[PDB]
Amino acid sequence: EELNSMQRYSQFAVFRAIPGALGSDRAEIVAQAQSFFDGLETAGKVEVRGIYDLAGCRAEADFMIWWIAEEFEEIQAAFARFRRETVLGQVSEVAWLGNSLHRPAEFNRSHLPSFIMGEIPGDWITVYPFVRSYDWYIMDPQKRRKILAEHGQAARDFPDVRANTVPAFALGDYEWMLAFEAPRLDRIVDLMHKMRYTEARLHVREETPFFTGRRVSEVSELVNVLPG
Template identity: 55%
Template sequence: MWSVFRVDRPLGDEARHRVADEVSELFAELAGKDVVVRGTYDVAGLRADADLMIWWHAETPEALQEAYSRLRRTALGRHLAPVWSQMALHRPAEFNRSHIPAFLADEEPRRFVCVYPFVRSYEWYLLPDEERRDMLKEHGMQARPYPDVRANTVASFGLGDYEWMLAFEADELHRIVDLMRDLRASRARRHVREEIPFYTGTRKAVAELVADLP
């Protein structure tokens, strides 16, 4: 799940280290319940409507809902207003069933992330399997020059307004930009109906993130 917030009430001179410590303690407690916070991200400036994003995952949606609610009840949470949140679920890929998202393969998170939803065209699911498989293979081949950009594609049918969620992770932001640009030339692009909003940010420790908030 990706949850995006904006600062609704500035923290001002409040003891930010105590605010950050409370959130860090919450995350540590959640880890004991198998709720993993993959990263907290600074999205300020990259978006005019948001300041931070949390990427967390767990075995059950209820665990994530509880984590979300508990964050809202912290001192930091009382200064935040929700902007956007989307849950997704790992299911076998359409044709490459061996594909495992980077976050489930225990890969280390990278410095930058770009998160966005997408919805396929109405025609996509009616095309012959072989045609769809061929387009997705081409799409994958175009991404091969970017092995340092790690992909996370997860299903969100019925969990919100979208069909899929995608998160690209990389240590250099320009690599995500270049990959996204190059993938525009694939035939599968003709079958994307929607792919906004984009939330891109820098991964930061909680204390650093809180220190930078208004």
């Protein structure tokens, strides 16, 4: 309805820790970061959907910020302020940025990202980019439509895993930004496994890197775990 119509950019900002930069005394670093995110939230323009602990997912990445705003300029500004004006940003390196812009789906305008639906973020997440085969969009539309319907049917064993599938064209190297949120990580793993049993898998060119981690309740929890 109005949710298909609305303008929202989404960014997954993945950061890596620099060994030795952070130190051991961190209470004031914690206090300053929560203040930063507190200030963002009151300002009403950038919505932080989650801060995630990616420890142990992959080499060269440690945490991720998922934030959302009507204007990309607002994400640019928050991204820069975080890096420039928080100790946490000063001591971390940008590892990967996953940018996207919400649009109505092609065939099923009732398919909406969970964050657009305003659903509570899930405790666990996996994020990755996606690139379709070269022939996918110029394919006969009703064949693409059937494949996507079969794709959809294969997912409804996972109503507890909420999908965010968002266009990413010209916001980086990719066609789509994908994010799956669930109460338990094993359901995200099983969903990806089951979704291999679909004809849509014949129309895939890229889907890495993956970022998977745990949504923290409090930035305290992330800071205290990073390498010093």
